[PDB]
Structure formats: structure tokens, C-alpha cells
């Protein structure tokens, strides 16, 4: 698992497109190498300074060596390595590089999320699916940073120090450093797993307590069904105590981890210092070697202080990146595109042949359904409240797929046509239109982006909404939606009419809204529909009399099956739609 995940990380490391960023990557790697070299060099110069000082050297050489050592200590981090001029140049350049990868990953995720089929988006919520994506991009960035620039450099420092001590200092100090660092790493990992178990146990109860508090605040019914303020306080207190117990366990585990790491490094330092002092007394080592060993041990210790955290974060980011990859691979485009060739929209003839469709498991909704609309002619659909009418509207728009049957537009099966042209050629008015947070002019032009402002104004005039736009103070810069002011029913229905005018479609998949409003504005809206649906193939879905009376072919659906066919007056005489119209609306 480690090998494959490292392979994916390495694949994401190199910027594929720009050449100006690979140079920056190489410079950053070179700076990392230079930091390792400085890590080795500085204690050596400290030893040289002490050795020169102990033998009464003249002022000139001492001054120049002191200046050089101070300069090296400035280049290296004055503390914890995250401080020097080097590695800060590195943070700068890696800012510039990591920005590119973050943008690319975010755009790839956002461009994949917009092509999955509808059933996928009706299934899962939006908050969870966006949390996974955000956490995935943060995971890839943090994994690259953490590993490459904080974990491998330290494991290289340990090995380099082992080599230097074992070859250029003595033989036993190699054993000392090796044993100390091995024990440190082993104990850190072993304690860290245990502490992770405790941390998860605490986090669950924290979330539960927050939920309880939110629930007690939202329902101000505590006053009604009792004087139960005290009870809601007491349950909150009990939950708080439970959470506090778990938190105490977790943080005591943290303190234990810190103490064991400190004890290991202290034992190593004690052994090394005692051996070095004994050797110095026996004229085998010089006075500077003592401070060399002390400084180098502290220098090794400082990065090691943050390895439990790195272990935790590496594991978490690995599982997160696996989640993000497994939704990137989820190629559920079930209503995909086999073949190509744009639909030839001559006039707008729609056909049906005993189509079979079933999206709800077990039961089947649409069976043996076939009808036809002449170009320009208007068809209506009436029946009991359910899904069949909206379902067939969705089927015509190529959202789901037909299990068995045939469905054509102008003698052309839409199963073999590209989705883009199909969806471009067909207009529609939904149940309730939604205006995203932007200006009114932008919402109008959203029907066709390339169009200019004059078309926007002309269509707003054509839809009878332009005066109400002038009623707003700012006008065409007015903030709309949740951020801006709220809109009444006629306003949003008219803006939908405006944008569907902009789109200039051939078929209007009208779906009349059931929103309650004054009859005058309602009849104005229906008139606007009448002059926008003129000379265009139309399919109307409504529970009202207005669509029924003037339509050309009324259809009735019972459990997703055609029971009555024909015209308004024949259905009236049959004793069918007559009873439904008299009972439903009266």
C-alpha cells in the first residue's frame, strides 16, 4: 500500500505543464540539500571556535572564524530549522509551486462532479460530497509537503549523523546515536497508535455534546411542555462531564508520549556526554568535541519532537486521498453518449412507442405509453398527484434512460444522439425556479451567456418583468437571492420566462407551477406563456382548467399508464376528467 500511494504522490509532485515551475522544484530540492549540508557544518565550526579559543589564538583568526560561524548559524535556522534564510526561500518558492497543484486538483474535481448522472446527485447530499473533495485536495497538498520536506530530510539527518559520528569521531558514539534514535522512533509510533484510539473516542462525544446543545437551543418548546429548563441544563451537564472524562484520558496520553520521548533523548545525551568527558580527560578527544556532541544531539532532537503528529496526519491524509480518488474513479455516467451527431431540429415532432421505465425499485412507473405531438400543437397531461408526468418530462430531456422501448424527436432516436444539442434545443420552465446569488442582469443572461445587454433588456420587456427590475433601487446591479432581497412568485416565474426566451428553443417543456398567487398576476403569467409558447411545440403539465380547455390533445395517466385519450370534449362526455375536475378543484 505504501508503495502504490507513494507512486501516486510522486506522480502528483512534478508539474506537468509549465517549465517555469520545474526549475523552482529543482531549486527547492537543492535548497533542501544545502540545509542538510549546513546542519552538518555548523557544529563543526562551533568545535573549531572552541578549540581555537582554548589554545590562546590571536584575535584575527578568531574574529574571522566567529563571523563565519555566526553567518552559518544565520543561514541555518537559529531555532528548530524552520527559521533560517534557507528553507524560508524554500517556503516562498513552494508557495508558488503548490498553488498550481491545488488549483489543478480542485478544477479536476469540480469538472468531474458536473458530469455525473442525476440519480447520483439525488442520492447523496451536497455537504458530504463537497467535504470529501475539499479534504482530498488538502490531503494531497499536505501529504506532498509533510513527506517530502519534513520526514525524509529528518531520516536523512539521522543517518548522516550516524555516519559522521561512527567514522570521524569514534566508534561507540555511532552505537549511542543509533540506539537512541531507534528507541525514540519505535516508542513514538507505539504510543501514537494508542493515543489515536483515545482521540477518536473523545471526538465522537464532542460532536454528540454539540448536537445536544444545538437541539436544546432550536426547540424553544421547553417552556411549553414543562418548566423543563432545569432538565435541559442537567442533561447538558452530564454530557459535558462525559466529554471531559474522555478529553482528560486523551491529553494524559499526550503527556505520557512527551515524557517518554524526553526520557529517551535524555538517556542518550547522558551516555554520550559521560563518554565524551571521560575520553577528553584521557587526552583522546579535544575540548571542542564535547560541545560538538551536545549541539548535534540537540539539533537532532529538535525536528524529532513532531513525529507522532506527522504519523497521525500521514495516515489520515492517506485515507482521505483514497476517498477522493475513489470518487474521481466513480464513472457513473449511466446515461452516457454512445455515438455522436447533433440532433437535426427541423420542426419538433416528438414520438413515443410503449416506453418502459422504472427508477423506483420493484414497481415500474411507465409502461406501454405512446403518443405523438404535431409541430406547434400543444399537449397536456392530467391525472392524480404523483410522478408520472414529471417523470416523462425528465425522460424527454435525456436525464434517465429508457429500459425498453423507443423515443424519437423528428424521426430520430435520442439514444444515439449527443446530449449537448438535445439539451440545447429544448426549453423548459421548472416547478420553482431558483436565482443564485448574483445580479438580475446576470440571472437573465444565464440563459445564453454570449448575448449582450440589449438582448437582456429586450427579453425582460418581452416577459413583463423589466418594470419590476426598475423598481429595485440599484436596478441591474441589485443583489438577488439569499445574499440579496427576496422575490415574489411572479417575479421569479417571469425571470424564468425571460431566460427561456433568451435560450430561443424549439420545444417548450412547460411545467406549470402550483404556487398560490393572485388570479390577475396568474392570468398575466399564463398570457405570457401563451405568447412565448406560440409557434412552438409544447408539452404542458398542470392541475388547472386553463391548460385543459384550450389544449389540442389531453392525456390522462393512472399509475403511469394511459387510460383516457383524445380531446377535451370527448373526455368531458366520457364521464372521466369531468368528475376529476369537479372534485379536485371544488
Amino acid at each position: 500500500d505504501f508503495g502504490r500511494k507513494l507512486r501516486l504522490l510522486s506522480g502528483y509532485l512534478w508539474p506537468r505543464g509549465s517549465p517555469a515551475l520545474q526549475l523552482v522544484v529543482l531549486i527547492c530540492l537543492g535548497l533542501m540539500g544545502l540545509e542538510r549540508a549546513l546542519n552538518v557544518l555548523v557544529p563543526i565550526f562551533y568545535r573549531n571556535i572552541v578549540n581555537l579559543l582554548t589554545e590562546k589564538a590571536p584575535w584575527n583568526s578568531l574574529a574571522w572564524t566567529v563571523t563565519s560561524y555566526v553567518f552559518l548559524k544565520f543561514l541555518q535556522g537559529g531555532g528548530t530549522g524552520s527559521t533560517g534564510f534557507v528553507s524560508n526561500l524554500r517556503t516562498f518558492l513552494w508557495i508558488r509551486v503548490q498553488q498550481f497543484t491545488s488549483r489543478r486538483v480542485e478544477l479536476l474535481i469540480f469538472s468531474h462532479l458536473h458530469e455525473l448522472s442525476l440519480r447520483w446527485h439525488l442520492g447523496r447530499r451536497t455537504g458530504e460530497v463537497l467535504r470529501i473533495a475539499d479534504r482530498g485536495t488538502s490531503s494531497v497538498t499536505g501529504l506532498l509537503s509533510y513527506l517530502v520536506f519534513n520526514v525524509i530530510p529528518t531520516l536523512a539527518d539521522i543517518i548522516i549523523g550516524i555516519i559522521y559520528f561512527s567514522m570521524f569521531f569514534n566508534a561507540w558514539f555511532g552505537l549511542i546515536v543509533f540506539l537512541c534514535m531507534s528507541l525514540y522512533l519505535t516508542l513514538t509510533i507505539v504510543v501514537t497508535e494508542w493515543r489515536t484510539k483515545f482521540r477518536r473516542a473523545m471526538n465522537t462525544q464532542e460532536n454528540a455534546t454539540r448536537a445536544r446543545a444545538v437541539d436544546s437551543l432550536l426547540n424553544f418548546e421547553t417552556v411549553k411542555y414543562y418548566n423543563a429548563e432545569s432538565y435541559e441544563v442537567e442533561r447538558y451537564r452530564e454530557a459535558i462531564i462525559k466529554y471531559q472524562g474522555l478529553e482528560w484520558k486523551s491529553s494524559a496520553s499526550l503527556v505520557l508520549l512527551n515524557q517518554t520521548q524526553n526520557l529517551v533523548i535524555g538517556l542518550g545525551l547522558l551516555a554520550g556526554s559521560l563518554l565524551c568527558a571521560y575520553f577528553v580527560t584521557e587526552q583522546k578527544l579535544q575540548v571542542g568535541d564535547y560541545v560538538l556532541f551536545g549541539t548535534y544531539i540537540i539539533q537532532l532532537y529538535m525536528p524529532l519532537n513532531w513525529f507522532g503528529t506527522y504519523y497521525r496526519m500521514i495516515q489520515t491524509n492517506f485515507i482521505d486521498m483514497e476517498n477522493m480518488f475513489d470518487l474521481l474513479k466513480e464513472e457513473t455516467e449511466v446515461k452516457d453518449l454512445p455515438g455522436a451527431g447533433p440532433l437535426r431540429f427541423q420542426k419538433g415532432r416528438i414520438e413515443f412507442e410503449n416506453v418502459h421505465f422504472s427508477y423506483a425499485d420493484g414497481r415500474e412507473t411507465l409502461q406501454d405509453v405512446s403518443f405523438t405531438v404535431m409541430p406547434g400543437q400543444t399537449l397536456a397531461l392530467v391525472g392524480p398527484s404523483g410522478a408520472g408526468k414529471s417523470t416523462i418530462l425528465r425522460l424527454l430531456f435525456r436525464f434517465y434512460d429508457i429500459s425498453s422501448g423507443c423515443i424519437r424527436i423528428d424521426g430520430q432516436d435520442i439514444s444515439q444522439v449527443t446530449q449537448a444539442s438535445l439539451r440545447s434545443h429544448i426549453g423548459v420552465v421548472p416547478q420553482d425556479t431558483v436565482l443564485f446569488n448574483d445580479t438580475i442582469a446576470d440571472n437573465i443572461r444565464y440563459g445564453r451567456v454570449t448575448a449582450g445587454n440589449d438582448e437582456v433588456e429586450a427579453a425582460a420587456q418581452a416577459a413583463g418583468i423589466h418594470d419590476a427590475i426598475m423598481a429595485f433601487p440599484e436596478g441591474y446591479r441589485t443583489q438577488v437571492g439569499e445574499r440579496g432581497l427576496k422575490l415574489s412568485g411572479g417575479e421569479k416565474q417571469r425571470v424564468a420566462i425571460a431566460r427561456t426566451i433568451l435560450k430561443a428553443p424549439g420545444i417548450i417543456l412547460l411545467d406549470e407551477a402550483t404556487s398560490a398567487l393572485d388570479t390577475s398576476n396568474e392570468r398575466a403569467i399564463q398570457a405570457s406563456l401563451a405568447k412565448v409558447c406560440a409557434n412552438r411545440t409544447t408539452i404542458v403539465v398542470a392541475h388547472r382548467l386553463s391548460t385543459v380547455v384550450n389544449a389540442d390533445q389531453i392525456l390522462v395517466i393512472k399509475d403511469g399508464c394511459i387510460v383516457e385519450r383524445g380531446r377535451h370534449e370527448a373526455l368531458l362526455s366520457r364521464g372521466g376528467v369531468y368528475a376529476d375536475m369537479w372534485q379536485l378543484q371544488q
Partner: peptide, 5 residues
């Protein structure tokens, strides 16, 4: 080490 988690 933070608590970062």
C-alpha cells in the same frame, strides 16, 4: 507535540 486533528 499540537493538539491539529
Amino acid at each position: 507535540x499540537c493538539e491539529c486533528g
